[PDB]
Design a protein around this ligand. Structure first.
Ligand SMILES: [Fe+2]
Ligand SMILES: [Fe+2]
Ligand SMILES: [Fe+2]
Ligand SMILES: [Fe+2]
Ligand SMILES: [Fe+2]
Lengths: 348, 348, 348, 348, 348
């Protein structure tokens, strides 16, 4: 496990990648459920770097109908909703270290528009250490982003039956390489992947969760196939066995035809993340960045897309990584058999 | 002692009086030595009144030459010094509950300029409860403020031989009545007194700390007399037995002529405070507002007066109340033999 | 200092002397200011002795006019006042270990009348170790109780000028030897002393606090004499220096003629208690049993006497032990020059 | 659940069995993630038994590539690696109570070589209570050991297709009956099993994880068979469905030919342990001793064997218990179809 | 006050000066009453410096007849008495940080002989910060040592009547400058003074505690004179008013002629320490090193000399600083009227 001393050094390293120094101000955002060791370590490390530091504690926000303890599960209001003073208290800072899992909101977007950069850190210390950010990871992620911002279409195929096409261009590319160096940037330690959104009402085809593919926030390896039929950017059929029914039942509870929209789409670039990791953790350890980010996955998502000016504001939200896919941007393959093949600069 | 329910209720009471309601944002300012029960009662109470809330934690500021644990003793920089983001974090709020004892500073003056209010609350709960603030305390204190602002001169006599003159006018009256209701106001729960400052280089005569008179932050009842000789606003001679030598040596330590300057002067109007209270407490219990505010005391101060655009910025600061004094504003007496006599409204 | 293991062992010892075993039920009474180590040790110890145990936590009770943190200083309502259910929950136990300092009250007296026995234990572990109860202390105390119950009068002389006479007979003798073995008995770990009360309206003479004598809760060694003139069981004069005036001032604040009545009178039998102990502690640490029980002191008290059916229910309460006294019961001396001389079985 | 009282009494029981008394010294070894309750109980029980005690605290060691929070998952360096002084601090003691799970390493082996004995205690209190050690467990486990030390080979068959042969003799037999009574002896509260290692480069045949069989540290009951093919001490083939792919992925990650080596082999003799227990626990709750020690299991392990001078020093370590097995020493059955049949004195 | 951050940084400074780096082992010694912030800060700082570290926790040891919570007040056995394993646990290390105040004893001396060095650090962080150790301080203190090791006699005179003489030479001089750089060396952060002991049975004359002088551990400033008459290295008479009677009573209580022995003698060389500091603190804040080390004091002690193989191992230990003294080595002044005059290289 990770000692207190190692944990402050890790924060020293990541904050330094994030351009924290004596000119900079750091605000550590926490609530009752924040990991006190991580908060502590972020406060000490920041002070070691000569930054001006303060913590901001907000009362937790609860969505009454939300289930489980993964907060990515229900995308709605946040602790900042209606608390304009606290938001200003965070805008005042250059860098916010977020340990309370503030969700994407117009309130957060307003923080980012002032130049403030935000670094999310909520995984346990041990996950943090295995996926400790590097500049190499930034270069690789950015090489891939260049290639994605020039793409007009995205195609996914798998031997299991995925055949999925997504026109692009209408929306930007997002990257997460694990540190918050550039102003107005949000990032997450740990990460190491990229995505965009399909043009509105256009994503078509079928996506097949094979045996061994994952649905978050359920955090299970599927034991039977689920076939998703998608038309004009919405899931219209969900088929297969017990997982299929559990999925169908879970999406129905939200009682909203918006849950079925396809939101982000992208691939993983983090070789230190492992598909097997999730099997060694409890549900309540964290949100499982290993599943999201592992090298050569295809990650797609359902539900809200308000983050980029999409129509959908629904709380239901799934992230589903697929193994063993072939992924194509226009004519060219970025991933083949779940091995990353292009750009050459993006490869491990 | 004071339970958690009673503490919360007392903070509801004082925050009501400080005009906290649903239109308001409260910031609870704290550091690692803040009492957690007090912080939690303030946060809970503010939410009961439907105000938005957040807590602000700052790292402790240490002045390396300072002695004791009393923070009034050493007036220098503070954790706000060069820490604008932190200051903006407080400025966001309508009302700051200070549980860390931020000392008067240009940075704090800026906060009040914006219209933000500051309530200091750091004494132990039992003390807080005994001097719970009232609208009647404000009335009486504000009645005294009227008289004081007109006054051209202050004069103090005692049978023990105090004979002290101070010319007024050049500097404002300042009140403390225990709550922060007006915009840009600072007050301290608990309090109930007022002071001003004498004209530059002008104060003249002798002050005698009789047997039983008090020096803060030493927190001793004097057992022998201390005679202080004052020329052109400065102490030039300190005479007596052991307390005098103890006092001279304390002042010498600071190695600075600024320490001998007289700062605020004024009288106490808090009948629920008690001169005997100090001898039932330890030093580190707090700063002993009972000695400062007890009804009919004369309280004068030394050292820094940059608070009001004075020349002196030195850390060394004593507050000294005296019993059994007659105090005269111009020709008219406020206190006679330690009893408040004028204004009538201001009496108990 | 005392380790956790040694503290549980000490409690095992005292609870064994208090006749705790597998037939008995023990309730540990605590509130938020209770020493958690002592509570934990009481709970562990009782369970080691196979007793059935539980803890009762009450919300603290504050007297709004009370000053300081010692609770013997203000005798009025308690946490049990108005809380019949909690009282009953205490009544169910055979033995209550009180770690919250429940003052004597009608509710407590009712707990005692059900057979329930109560042991107070609030002093720090180190004082508790030093004055760990023995059977031999009980023997010595009871032998003095035998003598005191036959007494028709008590007389106190001292070279410093004490000359005090009190008829007895009207009221019982109370003993404290530091454990709670008999049903319906209250006792206090640590102690080792006994007292009674003088017949109503009858105590006459002078008691002189010599240099070095103590007033509780002030917890000072007197540096100047205070002379107490007493007539028909009331102090009618208090003369001397600063201590005199401080005492006069303190008693006045209560605005109650009753504070000046003489309540209990007795002597100490605890050689392991030391008159010097007090100047090695802080006011916060405890209520100072060393001062009340030290061998050969004459201890007297002012204020309430509703404990024994007296007229006075006032909150002001002093305990004042005097060194170097001769104490006579009828014509027979029990203490001479602060040394215990009779009964022979009560001596060290 | 288990109280503090009970937990301490369990440590007394176990420490006594482990021959702790007034002649002995106990070091309680710990880190930031140790259960403080277990620590305190070990400390206090050691003092109740009159031993001299201290605790040693090491800062935690993280293997940057390790996953999950079970420390049996990565057997590499430990917090003792290069910390010679800490090693000597543990060598000073007669008995180390290990509450941090010190992996078997050259440093621990050395400690044991000084005569120091070590008792591992890291399972949750309830698990500790369910498998509280007995002298009778020791007898049954020693009776089995006799037969193991007499064997020239070990053979496992099962209806599912296990057909596995292991020449014995090169390496010694090791027992675990739950307490550390003998000098230089390491044991684990709880346990109740025994094992040895096969001769170098010799183990042959196949081992079949049937439905219901367990891989540690994954902590799953397999839903599909996995077949392990073994040649000359090494797994050379892993076949089945999803469990098999996952397993293969996990072993490959470590990128070491060494992970594939068969290490210890043996059977379970703890009837208080239970194959079903694991499905009643979360992954972070413990290491799952139930799964390792249950009566009649066959337990084999992969990876490192430097414990006993074997060539392999790798981190990847699996323990795999198999149900329903026929286990033979030479030609003689010690277990048939998961029931223990010989020796008779080893049986329930 | 001092933040965690700052406190960690101070320990780096101090441990660097104590020559801690990658080659060294640091052991941090503690007990249940050790300040955890200080413990953490020391553990952290030694890691930041690449040292190997562990903590050793000893259960607290309590001398049943000890009074108060200053541990210098009773120098008998310690928590290491009889605990050889723990002593070895500490000898294993190159540098021990003592956060529990191991008293001087045959065990602590033995540790030091193995070449292990020791740094005591128990004063509150704020104090630690005010007298932060410097190389210059060492320079000044070794200069004074030079002088003292040459001296054949020490003589103290004061206007108040001190007239005291002590042959030197039988025993070594000892320095304390704040850091433990040399192997075999004990020091204390904070300090800055030096002392030796007088030849057996030889110190003669009178030492007068004037008004303003201090007795440790009573931690009072004397209000009346106490006169100590000294013959053949023992106090034979103690005279004055109330303080003298108190002191006599305190000494008698231990019932041991060895308490009256004159032990170390010397003077203070620390200008950042202040004679007034003590009056700003509470008894349980620390041991008042300000009072022991202030520049120009003469400090003498009573009770045990066993540390140097002296005859007396009694627990009653007093430390007594006098101001305004002339101190002479042979016939030359090192101090006059409480100001240090030789050697010139020791002056501030
Ligand atoms: Fe998503
Ligand atoms: Fe002031
Ligand atoms: Fe009383
Ligand atoms: Fe294993
Ligand atoms: Fe000493």
């Amino acid at each position: 496990p990770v000692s207190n001393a190692q944990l402050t050094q890790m924060f020293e390293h990541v904050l330094k990648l994030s351009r924290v120094d004596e000119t900079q101000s750091v605000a550590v955002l926490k609530s009752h459920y924040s990991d006190p060791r991580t908060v502590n370590a972020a406060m000490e490390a920041a002070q070691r770097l000569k930054a001006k530091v303060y913590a901001v504690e907000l009362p937790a926000f609860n969505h009454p109908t939300a289930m489980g303890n993964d907060m990515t599960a229900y995308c709605g209001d946040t602790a900042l909703t209606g608390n304009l003073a606290a938001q200003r208290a965070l805008e005042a800072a250059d860098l916010v270290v977020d340990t309370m899992m503030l969700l994407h909101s117009p309130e957060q977007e307003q923080i980012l528009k002032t130049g403030t950069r935000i670094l999310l850190a909520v995984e346990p210390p041990e996950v943090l250490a295995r996926m400790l950010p590097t500049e190499d990871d930034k270069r690789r992620v950015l090489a891939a982003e260049t290639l994605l911002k020039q793409a007009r279409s995205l195609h996914v195929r798998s031997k299991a039956g995925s055949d999925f096409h997504a026109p692009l261009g209408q929306y930007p590319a997002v990257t997460e390489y694990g540190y918050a160096d550039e102003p107005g940037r949000w990032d997450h330690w740990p990460s190491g992947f990229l995505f965009t959104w399909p043009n509105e009402d256009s994503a078509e085809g079928t996506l097949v969760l094979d045996v061994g593919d994952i649905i978050l926030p359920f955090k299970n390896y599927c034991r039977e196939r689920i076939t998703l039929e998608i038309e004009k950017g919405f899931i219209t059929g969900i088929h297969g066995g017990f997982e299929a029914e559990y999925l169908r039942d879970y999406m129905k509870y939200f009682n909203d035809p918006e849950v079925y929209g396809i939101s982000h789409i992208g691939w993983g670039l983090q070789p230190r993340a492992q598909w097997t990791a999730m099997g060694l953790h409890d549900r309540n350890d964290g949100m499982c960045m290993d599943a999201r980010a592992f090298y050569g996955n295809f990650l797609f998502s359902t539900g809200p897309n308000t983050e980029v000016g999409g129509k959908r504001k629904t709380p239901c939200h799934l992230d589903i990584p697929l193994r063993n896919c072939d992924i194509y941007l226009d004519d060219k393959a970025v991933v083949l058999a779940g091995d990353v093949v292009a750009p050459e600069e993006s490869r491990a």
